[PDB]
Amino acid sequence: MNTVPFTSAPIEVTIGIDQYSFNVKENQPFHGIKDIPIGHVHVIHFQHADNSSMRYGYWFDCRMGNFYIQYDPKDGLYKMMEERDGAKFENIVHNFKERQMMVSYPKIDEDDTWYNLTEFVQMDKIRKIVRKDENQFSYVDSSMTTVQENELSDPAHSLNYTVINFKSREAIRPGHEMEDFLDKSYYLNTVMLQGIFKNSSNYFGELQFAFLNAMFFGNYGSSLQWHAMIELICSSATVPKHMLDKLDEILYYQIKTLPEQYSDILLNERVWNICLYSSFQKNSLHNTEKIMENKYPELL
Amino acid sequence: GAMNSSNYAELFNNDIKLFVDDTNVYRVTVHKTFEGNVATKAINGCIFTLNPKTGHLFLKIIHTSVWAGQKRLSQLAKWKTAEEVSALVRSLPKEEQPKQIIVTRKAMLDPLEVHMLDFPNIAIRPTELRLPFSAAMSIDKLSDVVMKATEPQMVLFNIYDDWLDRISSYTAFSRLTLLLRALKTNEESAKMILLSDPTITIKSYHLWPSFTDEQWITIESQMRDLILTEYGRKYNV
Numbered sequence: 001m002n003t004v005p006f007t008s009a010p011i012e013v014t015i016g017i018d019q020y021s022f023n024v025k026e027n028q029p030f031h032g033i034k035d036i037p038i039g040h041v042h043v044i045h046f047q048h049a050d051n052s053s054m055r056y057g058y059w060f061d062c063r064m065g066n067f068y069i070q071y072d073p074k075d076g077l078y079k080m081m082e083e084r085d086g087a088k089f090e091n092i093v094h095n096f097k098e099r100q101m102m103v104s105y106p107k108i109d110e111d112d113t114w115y116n117l118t119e120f121v122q123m124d125k126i127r128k129i130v131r132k133d134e135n136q137f138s139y140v141d142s143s144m145t146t147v148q149e150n151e152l153s154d155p156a157h158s159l160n161y162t163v164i165n166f167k168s169r170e171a172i173r174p175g176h177e178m179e180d181f182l183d184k185s186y187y188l189n190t191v192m193l194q195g196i197f198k199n200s201s202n203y204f205g206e207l208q209f210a211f212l213n214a215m216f217f218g219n220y221g222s223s224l225q226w227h228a229m230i231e232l233i234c235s236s237a238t239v240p241k242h243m244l245d246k247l248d249e250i251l252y253y254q255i256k257t258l259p260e261q262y263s264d265i266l267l268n269e270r271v272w273n274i275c276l277y278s279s280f281q282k283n284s285l286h287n288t289e290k291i292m293e294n295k296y297p298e299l300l
Numbered sequence: 301g302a303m304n305s306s307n308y309a310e311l312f313n314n315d316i317k318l319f320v321d322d323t324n325v326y327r328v329t330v331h332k333t334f335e336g337n338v339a340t341k342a343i344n345g346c347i348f349t350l351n352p353k354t355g356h357l358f359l360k361i362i363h364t365s366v367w368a369g370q371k372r373l374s375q376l377a378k379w380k381t382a383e384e385v386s387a388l389v390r391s392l393p394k395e396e397q398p399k400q401i402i403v404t405r406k407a408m409l410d411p412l413e414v415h416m417l418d419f420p421n422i423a424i425r426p427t428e429l430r431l432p433f434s435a436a437m438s439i440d441k442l443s444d445v446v447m448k449a450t451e452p453q454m455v456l457f458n459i460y461d462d463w464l465d466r467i468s469s470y471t472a473f474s475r476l477t478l479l480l481r482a483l484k485t486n487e488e489s490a491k492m493i494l495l496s497d498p499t500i501t502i503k504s505y506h507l508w509p510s511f512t513d514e515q516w517i518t519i520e521s522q523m524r525d526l527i528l529t530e531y532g533r534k535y536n537v
């Protein structure tokens with residue numbers, strides 16, 4: 001079990017840790033989050049009470065270093081930093097635990113939600129989508145745009161998701177125009193899986209990361225990316241059976257976790273109705289179709 | 301953007317463009333089988349690809365053999381149309397290639413876009429207009445070359461005959477659309493108008509009769525009457 005210490009909480013803020021969140025009042029004696037499960041990436045995220053504009057946060061993995069939060073009054077945000085002096089850090093954390101000034105990561109024992117949402121998400125891949133190589137952790141916020149959004153403007157602050165475009169030369173073999181457009185298996189299996197992602201685990205990891213950025217930060221380009229990766233599988237007639245079964249589980253837990261009151265903006269009617277009812281894989285997502293029909297029958 | 305009433309004059313500027321109409325590509329007769337089921341029999345079709353500024357018509361004849369052994373023919377027809385249009389563009393010298401292609405039906409947008417990926421600077425555009433190009437097979441010489449074809453074939457026509465010697469391309473296209481609208485609404489009447497005065501012949505190298513300027517005004521008036529009439533005979537007005 002690991003810990004992220006906060007030097008202080010000078011401004012009122014809602015703090016999220018994975019799917020949990022709590023309200024911290026201005027200058028409340030809050031000094032961080034303990035008992036964070038080892039083995040998973042995590043995200044710690046922020047929404048200021050004064051300006052609900054800009055949700056922002058940090059993806060990290062406690063195995064990769066000792067990280068803490070300290071408010072910067074010049075840039076106006078809670079920043080993650082790495083403490084390189086391990087002895088200093090353990091000492092800080094031990095004092096704050098003794099004074100019981102930390103919240104406990106509030107995981108229920110039966111609950112696999114976070115595992116299920118981050119099963120394929122690796123810090124190393126996150127850091128290639130979010131390029132900032134001097135830090136071990138990655139900053140994301142509501143306004144960051146994707147490389148594909150920038151093609152259609154600050155590259156250093158971009159989300160370098162794998163570009164997917166169904167009407168592109170990469171997606172369409174010369175002389176297979178109709179075939180490849182109506183059945184995207186070539187693009188999925190040869191171009192993306194064999195060529196770019198190398199395996200389905202890295203594909204699912206990027207799909208899961210995109211969803212989580214859409215959900216936690218309202219990041220619109222991430223939502224586009226999530227739906228694009230779903231649609232590419234669903235519009236392929238030929239998908240490995242293990243991938244279809246895993247996709248059904250992935251989407252099931254994503255739909256289960258989505259705040260009910262955000263479905264209108266975070267779910268694309270066309271993609272889901274197409275995937276569940278028209279695509280080649282209309283019959284292959286039983287768990288996802290059942291939860292969607294019981295939780296969001298209006299969208300469909 | 302889409303082509304409509306408001307930007308109609310763009311058709312006659314000096315940017316090369318083509319209309320593509322796919323409504324006669326896949327043509328069938330529907331009939332009963334010996335068992336009393338229903339079946340289709342394909343007949344020859346054509347892609348109607350027209351430069352509205354010059355009147356040049358690239359009539360790609362679609363022979364029924366292209367459908368042999370294929371499924372989902374109405375869907376295939378759109379992709380076949382896009383393949384042939386793409387092939388046509390590639391066959392033209394660079395300085396003759398169009399800057400825009402306007403499809404008369406929106407279902408042609410994605411097939412043509414995918415086939416034209418090599419031509420990113422050619423704009424593929426829909427239209428809000430309800431254009432009458434389906435009636436092209438009511439022009440006897442076009443119908444005849446399509447039905448007689450024994451193999452895939454491209455035939456080049458000028459659908460304006462020699463009109464551009466005396467009128468503008470705006471006026472030519474407007475005349476063409478009026479003739480085709482008439483032929484589409486009431487083919488027999490429209491055709492009676494065009495040929496009953498027998499002294500006005502169709503030159504061997506033309507599609508329409510050799511009307512004088514004055515005779516064209518009379519003809520155009522008769523076609524407008526026809527179209528309003530049939531609009532009454534249909535709506536009872």
Ligand SMILES: Cc1ccc(O)c(NS(=O)(=O)N(C)C(C)C)c1
Nearest residue numbers: 005006007068069083088089092
């Ligand atoms: C919370 C935390 C973690 C790592 C750090 O390095 C610091 N620096 S400090 O805030 O300067 N500090 C040592 C304590 C008085 C708290 C604080």
